[PDB]
Structures are given as C-alpha cells and as structure tokens.
Amino acid sequence: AETEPQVGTAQGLAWTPVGGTLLTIEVAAVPGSGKLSLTGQLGEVMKESAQAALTYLRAHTQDYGLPEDFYNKVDLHVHVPDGATPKDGPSAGITMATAIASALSRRPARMDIAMTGEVSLRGKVMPIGGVKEKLLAAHQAGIHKI
Amino acid sequence: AETEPQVGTAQGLAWTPVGGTLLTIEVAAVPGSGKLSLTGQLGEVMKESAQAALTYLRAHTQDYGLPEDFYNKVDLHVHVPDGATPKDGPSAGITMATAIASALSRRPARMDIAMTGEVSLRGKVMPIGGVKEKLLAAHQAGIHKIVLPKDNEAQLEELPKEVLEGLEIKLVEDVGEVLEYLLLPEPTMPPVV
C-alpha cells in the first residue's frame, strides 16, 4: 500500500487463480480536444466499464465540481500499470470512477482504502465475484478499509 | 557506442535469449497537427510505453521548458532502428521519455549513458527484467555509466566483481531525475514552432 493521498490515482483489487492482488489505476487529464486513451493491456469489458464511468460523470457534472465543458476540451488517459500483464473484467468500475473524478476535479483521492464494484450508467453499484481472495489480498498489504 | 551528444536520440538496452544488445531510439519533431507515428516494427506494449511517456510530458511542460502547445502544433515520429527486427516489451520507457524531451526542448541528450526502466503515468520508474545481460552488453560496447531503477538494486550482485568496479550506476525512482541527469542544460537548435 501507499500512504499519501494522490491526485488521479485509486487503489483496487484483482482476482487471479493463485490469489488476489492489488491493482492501481492512474489517470491523467491534459488539455486537448476530447479523447480517451486506455492503456495497460486492457480487455474489452474493462474498456466498456471505463466508458460507462465517464458517461455517468458527464451526466452529473454539477454535483462533484467538475468543469462544465471537459468533454471537448480535455484528453483523458487511463493507464493500468504494469504493461505486459493482460487485465479484464467488469469489477473495476468504481475504481475508475473515483480516479477519473479525482483527475478532473483536482481533489486528491485517498489511497488507504481499497475498493471494488461494477458500475452502471445510472451510477449504481452492482455485485462482483471473488470477494474472499480480494479481501485477503487487501489484508496482507496492510489496508484496513474496504 | 556513440560519443557526441545528439538531439532527440537516446541509448537504451535490450535483451534477446542470445544476449544483450544496444537499442537506439530516434525521435523527430516537425511542424504539424499533432500525430504520433511509431515505426521500426514495434510491439503493442512498446507503443503503449511511448504513449504513456508522451502523456507524462504533456502535463509538465513548464518544468522542462517544452513549448506550451505542442499537442496540436507538432507531429512526432519515433523510430527504433533497424526496420527489419521486431521489438517489444515495457522496459524501454524512460529512454523514450528522454528522446522525446530532447527532441521537443531542443536540448542534446548525452549518449555515453545507457538507461533502462519502465515509466508510469505519474512519472514513476518501475523495475525491469534481465539486468545482467543488459549491463554486460553495455560494458562490452564501451559505455561506463548506467541509469537503473531503485528496485533493481538486488539484481546487481549477479554480476562479476570486475564489471561492477568499472561501471557507475545511478539508481533513480522518478523520471525527473533521469531528465535532469541526461539532458545538457543549453538549447542548441532553434525550436520547432
């Protein structure tokens, strides 16, 4: 784990058949024309979850202090380190929503809380699989808030 | 190895199962509309490394003296010789960042320092694999200064003791230290507008 709250970074949990692991999602909002780069050997379901999170934040732009016109003024890059490790599944929707909101609104997300959950387009958290391995992996690394 | 420092060129390391090899990375920055050509028959992970390094440099333009609007004024082209050999892997991340910053800020990059490391989007240098072969190849080709991530310090005793006394390793953990150590402080060429 890490200690300081970071801007545009969020802690999430991944399931593998040999146990759980941490995955960090980090995003960057640079001035541009409105694009979405998605890197880190991502599968298709995870890219669609990123787009669902971005559409939810575009619909509710007054509630979180986001800029009112980021959809055609800001390029967004979503990187899931590291490369050469393929990553897929819908269970990182909450992590991407937190990371994108932190990068657009310039407020630091805190990194001593691991999270997991699938997001829908109404902003509605949906249940996941592999809870036990994820929580054990979060408890190995010294994170005590889920 | 090369001797004279060049503008937009960096000296990286690679390894095949045969052994270590020197990579050279060349970047050109010409007037344009904002594009990114990536040639030299590169893998997909290596293209994602280049995009991550460029997105890092687009957010810290005033730190390094880059022009403040190159994202829609400059076309970049990254070429990794030679064109026939395929190249893939995440381990050439900070050498691409050094080459791109040298090409945009018009500051020559030192070519007597090899480097290797994986860059992230916050500018962190993540550990790599195959340290022994890369450092042996860099010692055979004549280079005596190495930049290496902080977390690969454990692998350094896989080397013979007479190689470690001839080398001079700088252990970094963020890419700002690499760009401060590699780039010569004065711009030579006129800037790409």
mmCIF file of N, CA and C in Angstrom, chain A residues 14-103:
data_model
loop_
_atom_site.group_PDB
_atom_site.id
_atom_site.type_symbol
_atom_site.label_atom_id
_atom_site.label_comp_id
_atom_site.label_asym_id
_atom_site.label_seq_id
_atom_site.Cartn_x
_atom_site.Cartn_y
_atom_site.Cartn_z
ATOM 1 N N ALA A 14 -7.711 -7.105 -7.578
ATOM 2 C CA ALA A 14 -7.885 -8.023 -8.687
ATOM 3 C C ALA A 14 -7.818 -9.461 -8.206
ATOM 4 N N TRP A 15 -8.501 -10.327 -8.938
ATOM 5 C CA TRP A 15 -8.585 -11.749 -8.652
ATOM 6 C C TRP A 15 -7.775 -12.490 -9.699
ATOM 7 N N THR A 16 -6.968 -13.446 -9.273
ATOM 8 C CA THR A 16 -6.222 -14.354 -10.127
ATOM 9 C C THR A 16 -6.427 -15.736 -9.534
ATOM 10 N N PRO A 17 -6.276 -16.808 -10.320
ATOM 11 C CA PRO A 17 -6.494 -18.147 -9.755
ATOM 12 C C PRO A 17 -5.431 -18.609 -8.772
ATOM 13 N N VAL A 18 -4.379 -17.837 -8.534
ATOM 14 C CA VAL A 18 -3.442 -18.121 -7.467
ATOM 15 C C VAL A 18 -3.589 -17.120 -6.324
ATOM 16 N N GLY A 19 -4.654 -16.331 -6.323
ATOM 17 C CA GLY A 19 -4.937 -15.432 -5.224
ATOM 18 C C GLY A 19 -5.254 -14.030 -5.698
ATOM 19 N N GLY A 20 -5.394 -13.157 -4.741
ATOM 20 C CA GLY A 20 -5.691 -11.780 -5.051
ATOM 21 C C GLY A 20 -4.450 -10.948 -5.193
ATOM 22 N N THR A 21 -4.633 -9.756 -5.743
ATOM 23 C CA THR A 21 -3.542 -8.808 -5.853
ATOM 24 C C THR A 21 -4.105 -7.403 -5.868
ATOM 25 N N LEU A 22 -3.234 -6.428 -5.666
ATOM 26 C CA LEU A 22 -3.636 -5.041 -5.804
ATOM 27 C C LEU A 22 -3.472 -4.613 -7.249
ATOM 28 N N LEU A 23 -4.362 -3.757 -7.729
ATOM 29 C CA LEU A 23 -4.091 -3.037 -8.961
ATOM 30 C C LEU A 23 -4.364 -1.563 -8.755
ATOM 31 N N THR A 24 -3.434 -0.744 -9.197
ATOM 32 C CA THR A 24 -3.550 0.696 -9.104
ATOM 33 C C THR A 24 -4.004 1.225 -10.448
ATOM 34 N N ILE A 25 -5.030 2.059 -10.454
ATOM 35 C CA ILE A 25 -5.483 2.710 -11.670
ATOM 36 C C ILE A 25 -5.062 4.162 -11.601
ATOM 37 N N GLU A 26 -4.406 4.657 -12.651
ATOM 38 C CA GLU A 26 -3.997 6.049 -12.640
ATOM 39 C C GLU A 26 -4.363 6.722 -13.947
ATOM 40 N N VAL A 27 -4.897 7.933 -13.843
ATOM 41 C CA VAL A 27 -5.408 8.660 -14.992
ATOM 42 C C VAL A 27 -4.778 10.039 -15.037
ATOM 43 N N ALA A 28 -4.813 10.630 -16.219
ATOM 44 C CA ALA A 28 -4.266 11.954 -16.443
ATOM 45 C C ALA A 28 -5.205 12.729 -17.341
ATOM 46 N N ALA A 29 -5.468 13.973 -16.972
ATOM 47 C CA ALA A 29 -6.322 14.871 -17.735
ATOM 48 C C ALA A 29 -5.457 16.004 -18.260
ATOM 49 N N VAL A 30 -5.194 15.999 -19.554
ATOM 50 C CA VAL A 30 -4.335 17.001 -20.176
ATOM 51 C C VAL A 30 -5.221 17.831 -21.086
ATOM 52 N N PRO A 31 -4.834 19.065 -21.408
ATOM 53 C CA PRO A 31 -5.654 19.846 -22.335
ATOM 54 C C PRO A 31 -5.587 19.279 -23.737
ATOM 55 N N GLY A 32 -6.738 19.228 -24.391
ATOM 56 C CA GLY A 32 -6.838 18.581 -25.679
ATOM 57 C C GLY A 32 -8.172 18.819 -26.342
ATOM 58 N N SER A 33 -8.666 17.839 -27.089
ATOM 59 C CA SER A 33 -9.887 18.001 -27.856
ATOM 60 C C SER A 33 -10.983 17.030 -27.465
ATOM 61 N N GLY A 34 -10.726 16.141 -26.526
ATOM 62 C CA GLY A 34 -11.712 15.203 -26.050
ATOM 63 C C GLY A 34 -11.479 13.858 -26.686
ATOM 64 N N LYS A 35 -10.724 13.016 -26.003
ATOM 65 C CA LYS A 35 -10.386 11.683 -26.460
ATOM 66 C C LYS A 35 -10.340 10.796 -25.238
ATOM 67 N N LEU A 36 -10.021 9.529 -25.443
ATOM 68 C CA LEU A 36 -9.949 8.609 -24.320
ATOM 69 C C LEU A 36 -8.961 7.522 -24.708
ATOM 70 N N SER A 37 -7.766 7.587 -24.145
ATOM 71 C CA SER A 37 -6.778 6.547 -24.351
ATOM 72 C C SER A 37 -6.847 5.589 -23.182
ATOM 73 N N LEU A 38 -6.749 4.299 -23.468
ATOM 74 C CA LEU A 38 -6.936 3.266 -22.454
ATOM 75 C C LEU A 38 -5.796 2.268 -22.599
ATOM 76 N N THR A 39 -4.769 2.379 -21.764
ATOM 77 C CA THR A 39 -3.589 1.548 -21.942
ATOM 78 C C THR A 39 -3.267 0.713 -20.711
ATOM 79 N N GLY A 40 -2.552 -0.373 -20.968
ATOM 80 C CA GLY A 40 -2.165 -1.309 -19.941
ATOM 81 C C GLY A 40 -2.632 -2.721 -20.205
ATOM 82 N N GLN A 41 -2.785 -3.085 -21.484
ATOM 83 C CA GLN A 41 -3.222 -4.414 -21.933
ATOM 84 C C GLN A 41 -4.617 -4.753 -21.416
ATOM 85 N N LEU A 42 -5.557 -3.847 -21.638
ATOM 86 C CA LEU A 42 -6.903 -3.987 -21.110
ATOM 87 C C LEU A 42 -7.775 -4.796 -22.056
ATOM 88 N N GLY A 43 -8.668 -5.598 -21.485
ATOM 89 C CA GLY A 43 -9.668 -6.294 -22.261
ATOM 90 C C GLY A 43 -10.815 -5.381 -22.623
ATOM 91 N N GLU A 44 -11.797 -5.943 -23.323
ATOM 92 C CA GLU A 44 -12.880 -5.119 -23.845
ATOM 93 C C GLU A 44 -13.916 -4.761 -22.795
ATOM 94 N N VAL A 45 -14.190 -5.669 -21.859
ATOM 95 C CA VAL A 45 -15.174 -5.402 -20.820
ATOM 96 C C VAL A 45 -14.687 -4.299 -19.897
ATOM 97 N N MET A 46 -13.381 -4.238 -19.660
ATOM 98 C CA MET A 46 -12.840 -3.208 -18.789
ATOM 99 C C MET A 46 -12.846 -1.844 -19.470
ATOM 100 N N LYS A 47 -12.618 -1.809 -20.782
ATOM 101 C CA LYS A 47 -12.749 -0.563 -21.529
ATOM 102 C C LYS A 47 -14.187 -0.071 -21.549
ATOM 103 N N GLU A 48 -15.145 -0.986 -21.674
ATOM 104 C CA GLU A 48 -16.537 -0.564 -21.651
ATOM 105 C C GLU A 48 -16.958 -0.079 -20.274
ATOM 106 N N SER A 49 -16.371 -0.631 -19.214
ATOM 107 C CA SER A 49 -16.642 -0.098 -17.883
ATOM 108 C C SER A 49 -16.055 1.294 -17.693
ATOM 109 N N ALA A 50 -14.893 1.562 -18.295
ATOM 110 C CA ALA A 50 -14.337 2.914 -18.265
ATOM 111 C C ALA A 50 -15.241 3.910 -18.976
ATOM 112 N N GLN A 51 -15.792 3.516 -20.121
ATOM 113 C CA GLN A 51 -16.691 4.413 -20.843
ATOM 114 C C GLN A 51 -17.998 4.635 -20.099
ATOM 115 N N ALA A 52 -18.496 3.613 -19.403
ATOM 116 C CA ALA A 52 -19.698 3.776 -18.592
ATOM 117 C C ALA A 52 -19.472 4.742 -17.439
ATOM 118 N N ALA A 53 -18.309 4.653 -16.793
ATOM 119 C CA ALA A 53 -17.981 5.584 -15.719
ATOM 120 C C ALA A 53 -17.851 7.011 -16.228
ATOM 121 N N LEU A 54 -17.248 7.186 -17.404
ATOM 122 C CA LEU A 54 -17.106 8.531 -17.944
ATOM 123 C C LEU A 54 -18.444 9.118 -18.369
ATOM 124 N N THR A 55 -19.367 8.289 -18.852
ATOM 125 C CA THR A 55 -20.682 8.806 -19.211
ATOM 126 C C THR A 55 -21.481 9.210 -17.978
ATOM 127 N N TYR A 56 -21.387 8.421 -16.900
ATOM 128 C CA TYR A 56 -22.022 8.817 -15.647
ATOM 129 C C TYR A 56 -21.477 10.137 -15.131
ATOM 130 N N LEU A 57 -20.175 10.365 -15.258
ATOM 131 C CA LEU A 57 -19.673 11.638 -14.760
ATOM 132 C C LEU A 57 -20.013 12.797 -15.683
ATOM 133 N N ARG A 58 -20.166 12.549 -16.983
ATOM 134 C CA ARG A 58 -20.623 13.607 -17.877
ATOM 135 C C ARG A 58 -22.066 13.984 -17.627
ATOM 136 N N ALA A 59 -22.882 13.063 -17.129
ATOM 137 C CA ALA A 59 -24.267 13.425 -16.859
ATOM 138 C C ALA A 59 -24.422 14.223 -15.573
ATOM 139 N N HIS A 60 -23.578 13.987 -14.576
ATOM 140 C CA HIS A 60 -23.671 14.653 -13.279
ATOM 141 C C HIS A 60 -22.415 15.474 -13.097
ATOM 142 N N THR A 61 -22.402 16.667 -13.668
ATOM 143 C CA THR A 61 -21.204 17.483 -13.665
ATOM 144 C C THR A 61 -21.263 18.623 -12.670
ATOM 145 N N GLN A 62 -22.437 18.938 -12.144
ATOM 146 C CA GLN A 62 -22.567 19.958 -11.125
ATOM 147 C C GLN A 62 -22.349 19.413 -9.731
ATOM 148 N N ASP A 63 -22.544 18.115 -9.534
ATOM 149 C CA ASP A 63 -22.568 17.562 -8.196
ATOM 150 C C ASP A 63 -21.181 17.352 -7.626
ATOM 151 N N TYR A 64 -20.153 17.298 -8.460
ATOM 152 C CA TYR A 64 -18.827 16.979 -7.970
ATOM 153 C C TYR A 64 -17.810 18.065 -8.258
ATOM 154 N N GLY A 65 -18.224 19.185 -8.835
ATOM 155 C CA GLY A 65 -17.293 20.258 -9.096
ATOM 156 C C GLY A 65 -16.444 20.050 -10.321
ATOM 157 N N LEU A 66 -16.913 19.250 -11.267
ATOM 158 C CA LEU A 66 -16.180 19.034 -12.492
ATOM 159 C C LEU A 66 -16.314 20.263 -13.383
ATOM 160 N N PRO A 67 -15.354 20.496 -14.277
ATOM 161 C CA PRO A 67 -15.508 21.579 -15.248
ATOM 162 C C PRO A 67 -16.657 21.304 -16.194
ATOM 163 N N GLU A 68 -17.337 22.371 -16.596
ATOM 164 C CA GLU A 68 -18.609 22.214 -17.283
ATOM 165 C C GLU A 68 -18.461 21.804 -18.737
ATOM 166 N N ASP A 69 -17.254 21.825 -19.282
ATOM 167 C CA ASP A 69 -17.036 21.516 -20.686
ATOM 168 C C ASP A 69 -15.787 20.672 -20.879
ATOM 169 N N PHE A 70 -15.594 19.657 -20.045
ATOM 170 C CA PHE A 70 -14.413 18.840 -20.253
ATOM 171 C C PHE A 70 -14.571 17.867 -21.404
ATOM 172 N N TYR A 71 -15.778 17.697 -21.940
ATOM 173 C CA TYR A 71 -15.993 16.655 -22.932
ATOM 174 C C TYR A 71 -15.370 16.993 -24.274
ATOM 175 N N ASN A 72 -15.064 18.261 -24.532
ATOM 176 C CA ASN A 72 -14.375 18.600 -25.769
ATOM 177 C C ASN A 72 -13.218 19.563 -25.544
ATOM 178 N N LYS A 73 -12.665 19.608 -24.343
ATOM 179 C CA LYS A 73 -11.502 20.417 -24.056
ATOM 180 C C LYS A 73 -10.374 19.645 -23.404
ATOM 181 N N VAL A 74 -10.600 18.401 -23.008
ATOM 182 C CA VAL A 74 -9.691 17.653 -22.155
ATOM 183 C C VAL A 74 -9.519 16.267 -22.738
ATOM 184 N N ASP A 75 -8.277 15.850 -22.927
ATOM 185 C CA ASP A 75 -7.965 14.473 -23.264
ATOM 186 C C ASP A 75 -7.684 13.709 -21.984
ATOM 187 N N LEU A 76 -8.196 12.490 -21.908
ATOM 188 C CA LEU A 76 -8.048 11.634 -20.745
ATOM 189 C C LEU A 76 -7.271 10.388 -21.115
ATOM 190 N N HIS A 77 -6.297 10.047 -20.287
ATOM 191 C CA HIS A 77 -5.546 8.820 -20.466
ATOM 192 C C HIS A 77 -5.707 7.994 -19.208
ATOM 193 N N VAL A 78 -6.099 6.736 -19.374
ATOM 194 C CA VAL A 78 -6.319 5.812 -18.273
ATOM 195 C C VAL A 78 -5.307 4.697 -18.411
ATOM 196 N N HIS A 79 -4.378 4.613 -17.474
ATOM 197 C CA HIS A 79 -3.309 3.636 -17.527
ATOM 198 C C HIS A 79 -3.430 2.718 -16.328
ATOM 199 N N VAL A 80 -3.363 1.419 -16.575
ATOM 200 C CA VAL A 80 -3.350 0.432 -15.508
ATOM 201 C C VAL A 80 -2.000 -0.268 -15.529
ATOM 202 N N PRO A 81 -1.064 0.153 -14.688
ATOM 203 C CA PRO A 81 0.250 -0.484 -14.662
ATOM 204 C C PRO A 81 0.181 -1.845 -13.988
ATOM 205 N N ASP A 82 1.013 -2.784 -14.441
ATOM 206 C CA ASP A 82 2.056 -2.593 -15.445
ATOM 207 C C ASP A 82 1.684 -3.126 -16.809
ATOM 208 N N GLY A 83 2.468 -2.767 -17.814
ATOM 209 C CA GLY A 83 2.328 -3.384 -19.111
ATOM 210 C C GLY A 83 2.805 -4.819 -19.090
ATOM 211 N N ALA A 84 2.471 -5.525 -20.173
ATOM 212 C CA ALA A 84 2.717 -6.962 -20.342
ATOM 213 C C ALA A 84 2.082 -7.776 -19.220
ATOM 214 N N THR A 85 0.886 -7.381 -18.823
ATOM 215 C CA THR A 85 0.042 -8.160 -17.935
ATOM 216 C C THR A 85 -1.392 -7.905 -18.361
ATOM 217 N N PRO A 86 -2.033 -8.845 -19.050
ATOM 218 C CA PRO A 86 -3.397 -8.599 -19.519
ATOM 219 C C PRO A 86 -4.394 -8.624 -18.376
ATOM 220 N N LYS A 87 -5.361 -7.714 -18.453
ATOM 221 C CA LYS A 87 -6.285 -7.406 -17.373
ATOM 222 C C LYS A 87 -7.683 -7.218 -17.943
ATOM 223 N N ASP A 88 -8.672 -7.887 -17.355
ATOM 224 C CA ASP A 88 -10.021 -7.855 -17.902
ATOM 225 C C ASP A 88 -11.016 -8.132 -16.785
ATOM 226 N N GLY A 89 -12.266 -7.743 -17.021
ATOM 227 C CA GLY A 89 -13.335 -7.954 -16.076
ATOM 228 C C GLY A 89 -14.069 -6.667 -15.783
ATOM 229 N N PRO A 90 -15.324 -6.757 -15.353
ATOM 230 C CA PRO A 90 -16.107 -5.549 -15.096
ATOM 231 C C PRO A 90 -15.979 -4.990 -13.694
ATOM 232 N N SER A 91 -15.191 -5.605 -12.823
ATOM 233 C CA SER A 91 -15.236 -5.312 -11.402
ATOM 234 C C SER A 91 -14.360 -4.142 -10.995
ATOM 235 N N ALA A 92 -13.953 -3.298 -11.929
ATOM 236 C CA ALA A 92 -13.151 -2.130 -11.602
ATOM 237 C C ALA A 92 -13.853 -0.844 -12.000
ATOM 238 N N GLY A 93 -15.175 -0.841 -11.997
ATOM 239 C CA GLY A 93 -15.913 0.338 -12.387
ATOM 240 C C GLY A 93 -15.886 1.438 -11.355
ATOM 241 N N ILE A 94 -15.894 1.063 -10.081
ATOM 242 C CA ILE A 94 -15.869 2.041 -9.002
ATOM 243 C C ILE A 94 -14.506 2.707 -8.908
ATOM 244 N N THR A 95 -13.450 1.937 -9.153
ATOM 245 C CA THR A 95 -12.094 2.457 -9.083
ATOM 246 C C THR A 95 -11.845 3.471 -10.183
ATOM 247 N N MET A 96 -12.347 3.189 -11.379
ATOM 248 C CA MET A 96 -12.178 4.107 -12.491
ATOM 249 C C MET A 96 -13.002 5.365 -12.311
ATOM 250 N N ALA A 97 -14.192 5.249 -11.729
ATOM 251 C CA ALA A 97 -14.994 6.437 -11.472
ATOM 252 C C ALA A 97 -14.318 7.346 -10.457
ATOM 253 N N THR A 98 -13.738 6.764 -9.406
ATOM 254 C CA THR A 98 -13.016 7.561 -8.418
ATOM 255 C C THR A 98 -11.783 8.219 -9.018
ATOM 256 N N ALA A 99 -11.033 7.483 -9.836
ATOM 257 C CA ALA A 99 -9.825 8.031 -10.437
ATOM 258 C C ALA A 99 -10.130 9.151 -11.423
ATOM 259 N N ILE A 100 -11.126 8.961 -12.296
ATOM 260 C CA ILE A 100 -11.481 9.984 -13.274
ATOM 261 C C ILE A 100 -12.031 11.228 -12.589
ATOM 262 N N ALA A 101 -12.841 11.053 -11.540
ATOM 263 C CA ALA A 101 -13.365 12.213 -10.830
ATOM 264 C C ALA A 101 -12.275 12.962 -10.087
ATOM 265 N N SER A 102 -11.286 12.240 -9.570
ATOM 266 C CA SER A 102 -10.187 12.892 -8.877
ATOM 267 C C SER A 102 -9.289 13.643 -9.842
ATOM 268 N N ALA A 103 -9.101 13.111 -11.044
ATOM 269 C CA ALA A 103 -8.254 13.802 -12.001
ATOM 270 C C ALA A 103 -8.942 15.003 -12.608
#
